[PDB]
Amino acid sequence: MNIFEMLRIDEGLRLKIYKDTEGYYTIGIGHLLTKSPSLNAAKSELDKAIGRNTNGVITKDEAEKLFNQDVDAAVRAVLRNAKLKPVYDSLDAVRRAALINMVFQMGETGVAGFTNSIRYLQQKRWDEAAVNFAKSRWYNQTPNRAKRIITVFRTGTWDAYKNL
Numbered sequence: 001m002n003i004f005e006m007l008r009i010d011e012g013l014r015l016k017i018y019k020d021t022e023g024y025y026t027i028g029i030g031h032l033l034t035k036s037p038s039l040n041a042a043k044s045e046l047d048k049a050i051g052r053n054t055n056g057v058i059t060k061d062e063a064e065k066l067f068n069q070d071v072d073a074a075v076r077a078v079l080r081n082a083k084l085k086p087v088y089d090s091l092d093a094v095r096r097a098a099l100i101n102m103v104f105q106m107g108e109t110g111v112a113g114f115t116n117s118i119r120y121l122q123q124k125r126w127d128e129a130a131v132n133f134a135k136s137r138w139y140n141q142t143p144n145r146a147k148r149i150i151t152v153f154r155t156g157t158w159d160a161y162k163n164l
Contacts, residue, residue: 001158002097003097004067006158007029008029009164012029012030013029013060015028015057015058017039025042028058028064028067029064029066030067033045033046046058050066077103078103084099084108084111090122090124092156095121095153102138114133129153129154130153133146
């Protein structure tokens, strides 16, 4: 397991535009297209990101290329965010993927908003972190995925993902 494989499982893979949980137009492996509620706007953003007349449809390779850009972006976000960095730094490699996973999913700001949970993470207070993470809109929104994430933070292993 690694963050790519992990995110691959959490985001899945779609070759056509779709909407994410918050209703945003997305495509591929969780590639958010735009925050405009306009599909047309989305198709336009898609052709721009792909640099082709896509027609709302991409190829797998196309999805992976966006995915790479996106993981990189999530990594930069964790490494560059004042709040996040210190925590990232204190984590083992496994819990580091979990954290990147969250940033990928909801952006650095969102993640930074889990004030206490991140605090507990930095301090290795695993169960306390888990409990606080579980008390959230994030958790309610995408419970299945939040649950795996939290298990990782809780256990520090890939148990939640490895037999998927």
